[PDB]
Amino acid sequence: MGDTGKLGRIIRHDAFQVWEGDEPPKLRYVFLFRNKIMFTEQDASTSPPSYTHYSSIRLDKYNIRQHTTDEDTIVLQPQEPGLPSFRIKPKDFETSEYVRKAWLRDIAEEQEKYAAERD
């Protein structure tokens, strides 16, 4: 790909420790930029593997669902041949939720600038 990438920071960027395609846990830094969700799956699979920003999702041709009622979880479903069903859990750190709660709302209406930009 190269090194022609910007910082973005236009939407949201947090690390969600979850399990993609039924495969063992990952530590992906989910970065939402413009209209796509690119998460760097920092997979501590020994040493050689891991995912150098290889995994990515686009809010165009993907199906998505969301769990709530204390258990907030964004679950995307593959409406494209290949993509697996991978969730995201509130594996933030100590106390949170309210952080990931905003993440849902973000998905429901990507780009803060579209509505009202802050900071």
UniProtKB/Swiss-Prot annotation:
How does a null allele present? Answer: Mutants lacking isoform a, isoform b, isoform e and isoform f have an abnormal organization of the myofilament lattice of body wall and pharyngeal muscles. In body wall muscles, unc-15/paramyosin accumulates in large foci outside thick filaments and myosin heavy chains unc-54 and myo-3 fail to assemble into parallel myofibrils. In addition, myosin thick filaments are disorganized with the formation of abnormal myosin heavy chain myo-3 aggregates and V-shaped crossing of A bands.
What tissues has this protein been observed in?
Answer: Expressed in body-wall, pharyngeal muscles and a few muscle cells of the tail (at protein level). Expressed in gonadal myoepithelial sheath cells (at protein level). Isoform c: Expressed in body wall and vulval muscles but not in pharyngeal muscles. Isoform d: Specifically expressed in vulval, intestinal, anal depressor and anal sphincter muscles.
Q: Where is the PH domain?
A: 3-119
Which positions, given as ranges, span the membrane? none
Where does it localize?
A: Cytoplasm, Myofibril, Sarcomere, M line
Its assembly, as annotated, is: May interact (via fibronectin type-III domain 1, Ig-like C2-type domain 48/49 and protein kinase domain 1 or C-terminus of the interkinase region) with lim-9 (via LIM zinc-binding domain). May interact (via fibronectin type-III domain 1, Ig-like C2-type domain 48/49 and kinase protein domain 1 or Ig-like C2-type domain 50, fibronectin type-III domain 2 and kinase protein domain 2) with scpl-1 isoforms a and b (via FCP1 homology domain); the interaction may act as a molecular bridge to bring two unc-89 molecules together or to stabilize a loop between the 2 kinase domains.
Domain comment, in the record's words? Protein kinase domains 1 and 2 are predicted to be catalytically inactive. The two kinase domains are required for the organization of thick filament component myosin heavy chain myo-3 but not of myosin heavy chain unc-54 and unc-15/paramyosin.
Q: Name the job this protein performs.
A: Structural component of the muscle M line which is involved in assembly and organization of sarcomere myofilaments. The large isoform a, isoform b, isoform d and isoform f play an essential role in maintaining the organization of sarcomeres but not myofilament alignment during body wall muscle development whereas the small isoform c and isoform d appear to have a minor role. Isoform b and isoform f are required for the organization of unc-15/paramyosin into sarcomere thick filaments in body wall muscles.
The family classification in the record reads: Belongs to the protein kinase superfamily. CAMK Ser/Thr protein kinase family.
Full protein name: Muscle M-line assembly protein unc-89
Origin species: Caenorhabditis elegans
Q: Which residues of the full protein are shown?
A: 341 to 458 of 8081
